[PDB]
Structure formats: structure tokens, C-alpha cells
Design an enzyme around this catalytic site. Structure first.
Site, PDB file in Angstrom:
ATOM      1  N   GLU C  23       0.879  -1.203   0.090  1.00 15.13           N
ATOM      2  CA  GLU C  23      -0.068   0.031  -0.103  1.00 15.13           C
ATOM      3  C   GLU C  23       0.916   1.174  -0.154  1.00 15.13           C
ATOM      4  O   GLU C  23       2.039   1.432   0.117  1.00 15.13           O
ATOM      5  CB  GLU C  23      -1.035   0.040   1.210  1.00 15.13           C
ATOM      6  N   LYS C 158      -3.964  -2.765  16.206  1.00 15.81           N
ATOM      7  CA  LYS C 158      -3.416  -1.607  17.229  1.00 15.81           C
ATOM      8  C   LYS C 158      -4.412  -1.834  18.581  1.00 15.81           C
ATOM      9  O   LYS C 158      -5.731  -1.717  18.357  1.00 15.81           O
ATOM     10  CB  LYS C 158      -3.307  -0.178  16.707  1.00 15.81           C
TER      11      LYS C 158
END
Ligand code: MN
Ligand code: MN
Ligand code: MN
Lengths: 306, 306, 306
Positions: C23, C158
Site C-alpha cells: 500500500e 493496534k
């Protein structure tokens, strides 16, 4: 072969010409017959006057119809409220039982996309209901649009629903959402939802370029364009919004919850405001038909220029 | 070429003949061997006696099998609880590791639909768990059925789960849900869920007409038929429901939450009721096999008459 | 024909050779130019050194690019933060407006899967946000992976997000999730999420066998491999996690809620830790590129041996 497409619609589709899909709810819940028929004719005429072919979609005697004849529109209208409210998940049952069905956003966008219609004009779209955290009551309109590559032309989401959560849900479903000529996402009856528009488009040509890109990419998720209520009907819309906020307040005071919550709100608003809600809904659908038709025509130009 | 289809099933599928898919859980968690094998044979015999071909689905040594031979059914049964409970998302891993897997509703409906089976008989379907508002624990069965065009024949949803939220979730996924010969959506062990059926079907032929319409429409979402427990096993079911409500009460009193909530409920019910739960589950699967086979046969007639 | 594939990538894809999608976020939010370019080159070199072709994906002047030239990587890097963060639902708009876009996980996996890339290396994946019960704020990454058959190589989720709910949501979407060489699902900056891994894989070859099975089965849902942070960066990661838990604590104490909740947490962590977060992110992406490239190569062997 189960679905009947009108010759006007099929010929337009064959040649890449502008077509606008329409649902069958302005009819099933409009003014007393034959006024609901007259409204339907008025909406189809706006589409025609702007250079597109109107494709009203409904199920009659078990036959899905895409594009209605004069006789069919009349028949549907005379049935009035007697028709089944038909979501996407209800289509097979209405066909099986040879019933009459007024298709909702989820059902209409299924049929429209099936035959290659790229633009579907509605009033509003369903959403996440208030207190969905406890109920999980969420319209299949949102799921359907997340997996159907079609553009829905709406005036936003009603404040009876949970607009912030509806916007979040649409993001998660990968639906591109844009407000028309505004940085604010419109509620249905008012331009003021309190939510920022996740994206903005400023002309029918802007809209058509996004749809064209979506088609070329072969993405399987759709697009919601939300067109704020015209200022000339803001008084009617503001009245409804005021009545809605009052109903919401009374609902809290009387601890209305569960499956009785949403129908209580709808019920109270109608007592306070009578026919102005329908008037506002008609004005919104007619505005969406104007802009939706311009979008469809601009898109047909892009397709011609490929 | 990875999937092995039995000759009986492939020949039936080639000629549009009635086939009923079955999952491999009656076997992996039934009575002590060889009683679980005998139960599996009894279920397959109900399907055969009603004029359909039973297609039990499982993964053996990494090979997905659709339709089991006598040897394969025996092998699967002798393995008992040693097999991996295999949801749709687990299939690739079980294949990769060359393991044995008993396929759940989500995995079984993937394989059944892959090869063109239209009717899948199960016991119950997974759902939205209690307190999913805090956990988001929701069965992939619901997602899978929302994007797989197949009919699942079930006895409803267990009251250990959140039945109202499960019904809402299914609506949002565009799954057509109908109760069989009732206006009430059945819980698994009792006909009384407290929830109205979103729709109703009254015969296997009614069911087949809905499936036939769904196929012709090329809709990509499936169908849940929920068949209330026969009155002749209502005593066994009522006992389980009573034990379940007691366990729910004790769970609240002892503040059992999080990932310990669902397994606590399951655990407490078994102590109070022993083998009656399995007896009820077997009766339900056998009832679903009877009606499911009639549906599959009625559907094959509609297909023949196309 | 809208999408531009580099000759290196297209030739590899034609011959079933190993390709790793990447990405465009290491670039848009890395160290000051030209350090972000140098990092991007370093990541592409890890892929190349391991025998795969790197396919960095981005949108430049409205052109989706799969595989970037030296000039394109330089141009993208010099743009820095000026590029649009482009989720899947934003792609059509960025194309339509002829903009520059750094594609997120949802957008990158759309393009990678479109052209037949089987392995996509990222840093982390988006998830269910904290207090999603009140907001419904859930990353489209999860939806996208649930309906795109591709393997995402990540270092987990996360702790700023709700990891338990993210795992539940992925289960419901039918995404196979496996931790790499651990029974614990990693958080991004720490190996300790407190959540058990739903499944485990122990080598790049194990991973490739699962992907190969998924391809052969023609399943339409994808795979998340989660690779725990290397012990050599555990100090940097532990610092970030400590700062994150402090920010979470301060957020509770100051009653930060709604749309201000997530950005407050991100903001506070950066003040306490400065550049160590980026350092940790780079180390994680580089580790994922190493293992992801080995997976892609092992997969190309399995494909060769078909
Ligand atoms: Mn609803
Ligand atoms: Mn679960
Ligand atoms: Mn978000």
C-alpha cells in the site's frame, strides 16, 4: 424471463441511453386516488422532460415489472395501500404467491441493477434505527447498496433514524456517500443533520464522473448521493423536524422503547402535521427526479464518449 | 476437482433430481459409537424414503466430501468428537492440514451451494449471542446465508441466543425468514420464542415455490425456513427450555459475563437435563429431514415443469 | 483498461510468479522527504531480495497504478501528506477528480485481488473502534477482507482499537485469522493483546498451503495472517503501548467521547513518544515484507506443482 421490461426501457438500455429507476411508494402511500396516480405521472414527466426514460418498478400479480405502462401505473395506483411493502428479501415470496408488491429501496435497486440501470431516484433511504445498540434494527437498504453497483439519488436520511450511525454503517459497507452542493449531510426534511458530509459533489456532471469511474472499475458497491431539501420547502420540512423532535421528547418522557419506539414517533408526527409530511416527501422526490435525470443524461454522454 | 461428490449425488444433480444436504454434527456429537452412526443412517433413510438423495457433507483427510459412502459415514462416526468443528472460514485450513472436519451451517451451505444443492437440512442455526452489544459475538451462519442462495431447513434459533436480535440481523442481511405453519417464530426447543414470524409458509409446496422464485431471480441471498418442534417432543423441549431459563437466571445471579457467559449456560443445562437435549435435537433434525425432503421433491417438480 | 499494471508485475502475473502487493502509506506518512522514498525503496528491496516482485499500489492523476516505476515512486513520495487517504469507497471519486491517492487496506486489497495478486503486505489493519457500541465506527478493511479472496500479511491490530471486537467481527465476516508462530493474537506494537489466536500457522509454507486451498475452493472471503513484532523492536513497541495505555487513562479521566475519542488517543501518544512510533511501524512493515515474500514464493511453488 420472469422479469418484464417495458419496450421503452429495454430499447434505451440496449443503446446506452439515460434511464432513471423509480420505486413504487409515492403511489402506494400518496394522496387519495386518483391523486397518487397524478403524482406518479408528474414524477415520470420530470424524468422524461429532462431527456431520460423513467423506469418505475413494481411487482404486479407476481410479475416484476421494470417500466410501467399507463394501464399498469393506473392499476398499481388504484390498489393503494393494499400492496405488500416489498423489501429485497420479500421479492421471491411476492412472486411465489403471485402478489402485488411496492418495492422498497433494497428491492428496487436489486431489479434496477439486474437490468443495467445506473441511476435510481428515491425519496429517502432506510437506515440505522435509534437505539439499534439494543435492537440491531438496521435497514437492508444499507446492505443492499453496499453490494450493488448503482447510484441512489436521495434527500438524505430522516432524523427519526440515527443519522450518525447510518453514516458509519455506510462507510463500513464501502458505500461512497456524497452531499450535493453542501458540506453538511442532509437530513430528509431539513438540511441540518449535524453531520459533516463524508464527501461532496457539485454538479450532475461531477456525479456522473463518479458513477462512470465506479462502472469502469467494476466495483460491486454502490453510491449514495444526498440532495438537501430546496429552500422553497424548508418551511414544510422545518415543521416536520420540529414535530419529530417533539415526538422524540415525548417518547423519552413516556419511556417508549423496543419495537414500539419507531412506530410511536411516526404516529405522533402525523397527528401534529397532517398532510405537510406527504407534501414535503413529494417535493423531495420531484427534486431528486430532476437532478437524478440530469445525472443519468450526463452519464450517458460519458458512456457515448468511451 | 478438490471436492469429491458421490456418484449418487452427482447423477441426481445432473438431472435436476431432489437432493438434501446434511451437516456432520449429528455424528460428531451424538450418542456413544456406534449409536451416532445409527442416528446418521436413520436421518439419511428419512431423506431416501421421501424420494430425495441425502448428501451428508464433511471433510475427511483434507478432502471435502459431498455425499458419503457407507465406509466414510462409518469412519466419520468412529472419529466422534476428535473432528475439527469447521466453520466456513476454517475450511481452507482443514484442507491444508489434511484434517478431518465436521462442517457447521456456514461451511455446509458453502459446499452445498457450490455444487447446486438447493435444500440444506440442519437442526438449528447459529445466531446473535446474548450481550452481543458488548461482545459483537455473532455467528457467521447469518452472514453466510445472507450471501448464499440456498434454503436452510431449521427448527429455529435456541433461546440461549438472542432471538430478537438474530431476526433483526437476518433482515439486514436480506435473508427471507419464514415460520412453518405458524405466526410465531420458533425457538429451537420450544415453539414459543415470543417473536412474531416475519413471514409464514404453510406447505412444502409453498416453500418450493419461494425457492423456485429465488433461483429464477438469481438473488444471491438465501432463505431460512423455521419448523416448530412437533408436539410429541414438546415435553422434552419444555424441560430444556426450563433448564435454560434457570441457567440464565443463575448466570445473572453469579454475574457471569464475557467469553464465559455462553459456555456457562450450555454447561449448566446439561447437568440438569442429561441426555434429553440430544434426544430433542435428534427429533428436530428428523422432523426437518422429513419436511426438507418434501420441499426438495416439490422443488424438483417445479424445475421439471420449467 | 483504466488500471495501469507495470510490465514487471504483469509478466510475473502471467506466469504465476510471486508478487507481493504493497500500500502507499509508508510513503505518505513517513520521515521527511526523501527519507520516506528511501524507506519505500528499502521495503521493495526486501521483497525483491526474497524472490518476489513488489507491487506498490497508488492512484496518480486519477490513474490506478499497480507496480510503480522509479519516477512514480519518487513523485508519490515528494507529494507527501498532500495525497488523499483513499479507502475502497473513495477510489471512484479520486479517479473521477483525477487526484492522487494513497490507498488504504480496503482499497489496496480491491486492486490487488482485481489483477490476481494473492499476497498483500501491510503494517496493521483497521478494526472495530473503542466504544463502537455507541458509534458503530468500524473499518471497511474488515468488510473488504470478508468479501475479497486475498491474504493480508499484518502485525495484528493496534490496541487503540477494540481488539476482541475486531476478532469477533472478522469471525462473522468469515475471514480466516491466524497468528504466526504464536497462540496469542498480536497487538500491533506488542505481542500481548490478551486475546487467544483463533488459529495458528508456523511457517511461510503453512501459510501458502492455506492460501492455495482457499484459491482451489473458490471461496470469496480472505485471510488475515498476524505476525507478532520481532523481539528486537519490543522496547520501541512497549514504549508505544505504555503511552497508549496512558492516553486511554487520560481520555477516561477527561471524559473524551464520540468523534473526538480516537483522534485524542492518537494525538497524545505522539507527544509522549515522538518518532519511535514511525520507527516501530517501519520495522513491522519490513518484517511483514520478509515473511510475506516467503509466503508468496512458497505459494508460487504450490501453483507450479498443480
Ligand atoms: Mn427494520
Ligand atoms: Mn461466535
Ligand atoms: Mn471509521
Amino acid at each position: 424471463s420472469l422479469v418484464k421490461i417495458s419496450p421503452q426501457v429495454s430499447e434505451a438500455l440496449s443503446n446506452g441511453r439515460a434511464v432513471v429507476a423509480l420505486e413504487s411508494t409515492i403511489i402506494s402511500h400518496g394522496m387519495p386516488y386518483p391523486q397518487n396516480l397524478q403524482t406518479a405521472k408528474e414524477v415520470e414527466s420530470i424524468v422524461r422532460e429532462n431527456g431520460a426514460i423513467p423506469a418505475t418498478i413494481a411487482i404486479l400479480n407476481g410479475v416484476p415489472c421494470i417500466g410501467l405502462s399507463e394501464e399498469e401505473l393506473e392499476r398499481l395506483a388504484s390498489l393503494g395501500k393494499s400492496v405488500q411493502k416489498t423489501a429485497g428479501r420479500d421479492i421471491a415470496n411476492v412472486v411465489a404467491t403471485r402478489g402485488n408488491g411496492a418495492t422498497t429501496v433494497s428491492a428496487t435497486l436489486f431489479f434496477a441493477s439486474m437490468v443495467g440501470i445506473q441511476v435510481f431516484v428515491t425519496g429517502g433511504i432506510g437506515g440505522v434505527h435509534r437505539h439499534a445498540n439494543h435492537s440491531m434494527d438496521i435497514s437492508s437498504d444499507l446492505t443492499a447498496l453496499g453490494r450493488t453497483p448503482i447510484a441512489v439519488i436521495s434527500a438524505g436520511v430522516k432524523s427519526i433514524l440515527d443519522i450518525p450511525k447510518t453514516l458509519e454503517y455506510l462507510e463500513t459497507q464501502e458505500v461512497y456517500v456524497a452531499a450535493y452542493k453542501s458540506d453538511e449531510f442532509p437530513a430528509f426534511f431539513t438540511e441540518k443533520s449535524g453531520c459533516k458530509a463524508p464527501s461532496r459533489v457539485n454538479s450532475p456532471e461531477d456525479c456522473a464522473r463518479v458513477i462512470d469511474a465506479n462502472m469502469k472499475l467494476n466495483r460491486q458497491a454502490g453510491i449514495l448521493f444526498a440532495i438537501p431539501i430546496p429552500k422553497h420547502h424548508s418551511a414544510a420540512g422545518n415543521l416536520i423536524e420540529s414535530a419529530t423532535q417533539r415526538a422524540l421528547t415525548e417518547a423519552r418522557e413516556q419511556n417508549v422503547t423496543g419495537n414500539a419506539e419507531t412506530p410511536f414517533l411516526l404516529a405522533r408526527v402525523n397527528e401534529l402535521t397532517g398532510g405537510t409530511s406527504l407534501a414535503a416527501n413529494i417535493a423531495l422526490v420531484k427534486n431528486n427526479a430532476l437532478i437524478g435525470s440530469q445525472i443519468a443524461v450526463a452519464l450517458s454522454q460519458l458512456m457515448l464518449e468511451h
